[PDB]
Structure 1
Amino acid sequence: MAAMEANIFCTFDHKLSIADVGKLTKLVAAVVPIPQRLHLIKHYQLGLHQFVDHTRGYVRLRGLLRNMTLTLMRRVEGNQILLHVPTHGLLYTVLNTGPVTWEKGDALCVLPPLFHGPLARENLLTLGQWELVLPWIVPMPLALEINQRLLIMGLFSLDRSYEEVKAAVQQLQTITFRDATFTIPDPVIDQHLLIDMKTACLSMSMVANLASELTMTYVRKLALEDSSMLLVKCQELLMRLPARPQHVSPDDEIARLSALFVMLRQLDDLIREQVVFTVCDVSPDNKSATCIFKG
């Protein structure tokens, strides 16, 4: 039937004030998600507020935001809004909203918003117990750190006391990245994290079963004849315990390495977020960047 819309007009079913339209004008070039492409939509379906719920899980919010549609904000008119869903590979001007610095040339990901410092800013759109919470556009390293720490919290929760898990969640919550500290709101172990835990356990076990004695023994052999901060550090993380290798076959080794590459891709996809933009520009005030859309 009707072809998918690209330009989407949004109308506010609420009496707007002058200040509302002002702080709404400031959001031009911002990326907002929507659940349903339609030429004219209503403002209730704008942003993440519809999904915030008594479940309160951050992983639930991430999973909901992944399946949403990303659109960019265009110019604002009195009580009306225009959104544009981008095409892959084109160049776009993108505004940042979270207090996370971008750099020229890094990858960006979509994640639910964190909270920063005193959490002093909540002057966004509120219109009769509705809010415009936008997702945070973050560079890849911070996104990997967030997903990794959530998975680590979940894994550690298994067979640790309630208070031990409390202390671990407290310490893993806090992330320092590019000289600013952010905190994850509501790390909660629901079923959505339980699926990730199950696949992480399966992936680790298959890695351990696939890895060959050459792969296992490289670390031990290097430690016997090399010494460096990298090696001593990584061996301090490890358990404690010439001669010829007793089995040597390159063809077996390459078959095993290929399978292990598949498994390591399986495990990486747990923390690896999908890139949505690639940056090549920064405004020197770091308010906006010009990006290539990757969706």
Structure 2
Amino acid sequence: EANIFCTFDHKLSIADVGKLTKLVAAVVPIPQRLHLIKHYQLGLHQFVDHTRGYVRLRGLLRNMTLTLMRRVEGNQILLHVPTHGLLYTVLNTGPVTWEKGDALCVLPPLFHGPLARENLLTLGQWELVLPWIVPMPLALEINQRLLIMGLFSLDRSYEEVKAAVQQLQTITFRDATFTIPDPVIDQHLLIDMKTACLSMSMVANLASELTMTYVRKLALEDSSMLLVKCQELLPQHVSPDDEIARLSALFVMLRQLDDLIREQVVFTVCDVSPDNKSATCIFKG
């Protein structure tokens, strides 16, 4: 049920065993949620295939159950999925800087700036690549930017989309550096674009007769920096209970438009050591 095991295959050199026990209380995903498994199901090396899709990769990563590594005693490793609400601990692998209070979420590993690219393990062919634990702003912005790469990709040639992704593939987070590896369009990206397009058009339809000119009257009467910076990108009936129902429909359309870039809260820190290596996150996985 909860305490599961992973039977290995090879002889175990002391260097790989040292690398394994230095990865205690770190995140690993599992496909099937069984009692005992083989080593092929651990990590993301089975799931990764190049020139297949980052969006498909995060789609299959979004369904997996996470686990934390502890008490390796040779030829197997006691994994333990965390229960909901109980405070567990996480040793991070990716070089993403954390801060106390910030909720954390899972992501696929993306290409680093200096590209350290430590495989964490050297076996026959199954290496151990790991999903990253990334906070809410960086994860939300990278999902947003991949969907904008989607909505900008269509009806275009290679040249303008290349000159735009030369800016758009670079994403910093608190003076770090990152780049998105393989933004290739999938059928699922067309699915997400179709849902977002229906959502934004449904938002556009039921707009009222004062919401559509509120920025216009606001830029008329007053003046501020965000006013002109949002203006650069551009009664008769008063029955406000109809506006209550209208904004209720607008609110379910807004949460449906928001929940195509949202990935749910996998963790939230409570205490992080000031070397940014181990933290105590109060959530399941």
Residues 81 and 284, structure 2, Cα contact 8 Å, conserved in 1: no
Identity %: 100
Aligned mate of 2:190, from 188, 194, 198? 194
- 1:294 Cα offset (Å): 4.6
Q: Distance in 2 between matches of 1:276 and 1:192?
A: 23
Residues 119 and 129, structure 2, Cα contact 8 Å, conserved in 1: no
Aligned to 1:61: 57
Aligned to 1:108: 104
Q: For 1:166-219, what per-residue CA distance to the aligned partner results, in whole angstroms no more than 9, with x for missing partners?
A: 222222111011110111110111111111111111111000001112111111
| TM-score (structure 1 length as normaliser) | 0.93
Q: Aligned pair 1:73/2:63, yes or no?
A: no
Q: For 1:248-268, what per-residue CA distance to the aligned partner results, in whole angstroms no more than 9, with x for missing partners?
A: 111111110000000001110
Residues 116 and 181, structure 1, Cα contact 8 Å, conserved in 2: yes
Q: Distance in 2 between matches of 1:127 and 1:211?
A: 59
Moved more, 20-29 or 112-121: 112-121
Q: For 1:209-230, what per-residue CA distance to the aligned partner results, in whole angstroms no more than 9, with x for missing partners?
A: 0111211111111101111111
Q: Distance in 2 between matches of 1:60 and 1:123?
A: 22
| TM-score (structure 2 length as normaliser) | 0.97
Aligned mate of 1:254, from 244, 247, 256? 244
Q: Is the alpha carbon distance of 1:287 and 1:184 closer, same or farther for their aligned partners in structure 2, counting shifts above 3 Å? A: same
Residues 73 and 82, structure 1, Cα contact 8 Å, conserved in 2: yes
Cα RMSD of the aligned pairs, angstroms, is 1.2
- 1:14 Cα offset (Å): 1.4
Residues 278 and 294, structure 1, Cα contact 8 Å, conserved in 2: no
Q: Secondary structure at the match of 1:73?
A: strand
- 1:236 Cα offset (Å): 1.5
Residues 47 and 57, structure 2, Cα contact 8 Å, conserved in 1: yes
Q: Aligned pair 1:294/2:284, yes or no?
A: yes
Residues 267 and 281, structure 2, Cα contact 8 Å, conserved in 1: yes
Q: Could you list the runs of 5+ residues in structure 1 that have no partner in the other structure?
A: 239-244
Q: Could you list the runs of 5+ residues in structure 2 that have no partner in the other structure?
A: none
Q: For 1:61-80, what per-residue CA distance to the aligned partner results, in whole angstroms no more than 9, with x for missing partners?
A: 00000111111111222232
4+ residue segments displaced more than 6 Å: none
Residues 21 and 79, structure 1, Cα contact 8 Å, conserved in 2: no
Moved more, 7-16 or 198-207: 7-16
